[PDB]
Every structure is written in C-alpha cells, then in structure tokens.
Amino acid sequence: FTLIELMIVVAIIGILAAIAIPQYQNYVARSEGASALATINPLKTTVEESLSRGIAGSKIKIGTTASTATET
Amino acid sequence: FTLIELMIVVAIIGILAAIAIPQYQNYVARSEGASALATINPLKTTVEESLSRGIAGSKIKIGTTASTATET
C-alpha cells in the first residue's frame, strides 16, 4: 500500500460525495394531494346517487356496514 | 555499527523504492464524470414534471429559492 494509492481513494471518495440532492418533499406532497383527491372523488357518485334515489342526506354515512334500502 | 549493516540498509532502501506507481488520473477523471452525471441526472425529473404541470420553461431555474405555483 502506497500513500498515493490512499490519497487517490480519498480524492475519489470526496468526488463521489458532493452529489447535489434536489428537493423531494414537493413530489411527496403533490402525490399525497393526488391520492387524497382520488380517494374522495368516487364518493361524489355515492352521495349523488343516494340523493337521487331519495335516501336522506343524514343517512349517507361512511363505513363498510352493508347499506340497506334506507341507509347508504 | 558495521559497514555491512549500513550497506544492507542502503540496499533495502533501494529495494523498498522502485515500486512502480500505475496511472491514477484516469480513475479520478472517471469518478468526476460519474459524479457530474449523477448530480445532473435528477434534474431531468424536475424539468419534465414542471413542463407536465404547465410551468413555463423559462420559469424553471436553478437555486434554493422556494418554488412557487408558477416558478420551479
């Protein structure tokens, strides 16, 4: 092992560092907003259809309970 | 101290020298190229995403300034 060998390794370590890391939280925030909008968008169909069929607005709830003829 | 002692030391000094040093600037240049490419590669995502969302190309700049809805 020579000192030139180790100094070249140190220089290449420094060069391999310093790689600029761009902003990434904006991408995550935008994806979260898109996911939320895509999650709550189909619920417009449920509310509108239930209101069209006469189901009371107070009877339109959120859950996995089996919807009856009066509750959705 | 004997002259044979010192001559053996001189011979071993000469032998410990003469160690061939291979080329090393090629490694540094290749690492620098890889580091530069890895630095500017993620900027493709930023430009493409900003163009997809309608941000004007002239509004896509480089810096740590907080990107607004119109500038990136």
Residue numbers in the entry:
A (entry chain A), B (entry chain D): 7 to 78
Study text:
In this study, we describe a 3.2 Å-resolution cryo-EM structure of the fully assembled P. aeruginosa T4P from the model PAO1 strain, the highest-resolution structure of a P. aeruginosa T4P using cryo-EM to date. To study the structure of the P. aeruginosa T4P, we used a PAO1 strain with a deletion of the retraction ATPase pilT to maximise pilus decoration on the cell surface. The atomic model confirms a tubular arrangement of the P. aeruginosa PAO1 T4P, with a helical rise of 10.17 Å and a right-handed twist of 87.4° per subunit, resulting in an overall helical pitch of 41.9 Å. The innermost part of the T4P is stabilised by hydrophobic interactions of the N-terminal α-helices of PilA, which contain a row of hydrophobic residues (amino acid residues 1–16, where residue 1 is the N-terminus of the mature pilin), forming the core of the T4P in a staggered arrangement. For example, the Q23 and Q25 residues of every pilin subunit N interact with the β3-β4-loop of subunit N-4 and the αβ-loop of subunit N-3. Similarly, residue K139 of every subunit N interacts with the β2-β3-loop of subunit N+1 and the αβ-loop of subunit N-3. In addition, the C-terminal region of the P. aeruginosa PilA contains two buried cysteine residues (C128, C141) in close proximity, which form a disulfide bond resolved in our map, constituting a structural feature present in many known T4P structures.
Type IV pili (T4Ps) are abundant in many bacterial and archaeal species, where they play important roles in both surface sensing and twitching motility, with implications for adhesion, biofilm formation and pathogenicity. Bacterial surface pili are assembled by repeated interactions of monomeric protein subunits called pilins, leading to the formation of a filamentous structure that protrudes from the cell and binds to surfaces. As P. aeruginosa T4Ps mediate surface sensing, the first step of biofilm formation, they play a key role in allowing P. aeruginosa to transition from a unicellular planktonic to a multicellular biofilm state. PilA subunits constituting the T4P exhibit a classical pilin fold featuring an extended N-terminal α-helix linked to a C-terminal globular β-sheet-containing domain, which are packed tightly along the pilus, in line with models derived from previous cryo-EM data of the P. aeruginosa PAK strain.
